[PDB]
Design a protein around this ligand. Structure first.
Ligand SMILES: O=C(O)Cc1ccccc1Nc1c(Cl)cccc1Cl
Ligand SMILES: O=C(O)Cc1ccccc1Nc1c(Cl)cccc1Cl
Lengths: 114, 116, 116, 114
């Protein structure tokens, strides 16, 4: 599993469950190409987005549909989503994209390991 | 000032100086139209991006050029740039402060929204 | 102003107002001696805690009373209070801004350190 | 495992390895009593600090020795440590205390689950 997403709720102190995540790859013409997607599990985790064979070097965008998440909890959010844009690089790389969510704030970190 | 950006450096314990910022607005046709751009000052702040008249209701994207910043300092960062996307002024004019705290492999961003 | 505190609310997208702050200094005998205290204003800022003369070299603890804050608003938070412990002024006098961003189950804190 | 600590490095984008963690319980006389301790593993994780039988309701402090961590990497840190003070409460509770570290900044979150 080369690319994993982890999403947490800073208001309830829990995994953020059933959050839609869309991954895009940057094409040669600079448009964003749909690459992979899913919903976070009960652990707030999203696995099996892609394989090592497909996950070539390039610029990727991970879009976390945070607005819909806060809406379903009855809370008015600030952001449309959270966007994590980065270059995948063969020179470590099991990528964990973690995001902590608040109504008016989010943080994201990359955990890159062998 | 209706839209302002503040950036801090979590490695140096300092304002993030000379950080390029590009602001876009979602157009009728769903494309990101260039709206405003600037660079953070010595205080890590960016003011005078727009006016109260030009800053109408819409979906805005604030792109903080974090990679260029860390690179300009001999650090190879994870992110290309931090992207803050939000609907602004949908219940009348508000004033927005987009705050960001930067580490090479992490950032957090928060919004301060006040009613003038 | 050599020591200042700024607090934001990540739930409301606002300054955290009326947040109690207690500052302690490590004494010769290793105990935490009361140093200064105050409350954040409408801007979420706390100034005038100490002077440049009183703020000598030492290990300081800034206690931001986050539980009291969230409780005063009908939210049951995780943390009792955020604790920022640091050595100050060990290479001559500096000015410190302790910044904190609060969520019910999370906070981040950063330091802005400037040479006057 | 009622209490788990996870520590990450925001500069290198990795688990923070070999970080000393000390847990204290608040005594009736308001002093901090040594409760449990350890070093974070290669995954930046610390498990088996305590058991359900011992982890009774009360105020606990998790002290993360961040200064020593940054020193060993040759980096001058701001904080003496990171302190996470909280009440353990029987009314969820598998507690994960997560901390993300930078030289002049840290964030911490509680992930509390059933
Ligand atoms: O991911 C973030 O940036 C938010 C954050 C803040 C404080 C402590 C931990 C985390 N994230 C986090 C968590 Cl809560 C668990 C596993 C891995 C990570 Cl990166
Ligand atoms: O800016 C953010 O979103 C994160 C953050 C984390 C910890 C401490 C401060 C901040 N932000 C922040 C900033 Cl960038 C300026 C003034 C006051 C604050 Cl609280």
């Amino acid at each position: 599993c080369p690319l994993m997403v982890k999403v947490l709720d800073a208001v309830r102190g829990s995994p953020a469950i059933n959050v839609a995540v869309h991954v895009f790859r940057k094409a040669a013409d600079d448009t964003w190409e749909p690459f992979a997607s899913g919903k976070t599990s009960e652990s707030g985790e999203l696995h099996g987005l892609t394989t090592e064979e497909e996950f070539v070097e390039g610029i990727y965008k991970v879009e976390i549909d945070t607005k819909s998440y806060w809406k379903a909890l009855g809370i008015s959010p600030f952001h449309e989503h959270a966007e994590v844009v980065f270059t995948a690089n063969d020179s470590p790389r099991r990528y964990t994209i973690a995001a902590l969510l608040s109504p008016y704030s989010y943080s994201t970190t990359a955990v890159v390991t062998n």
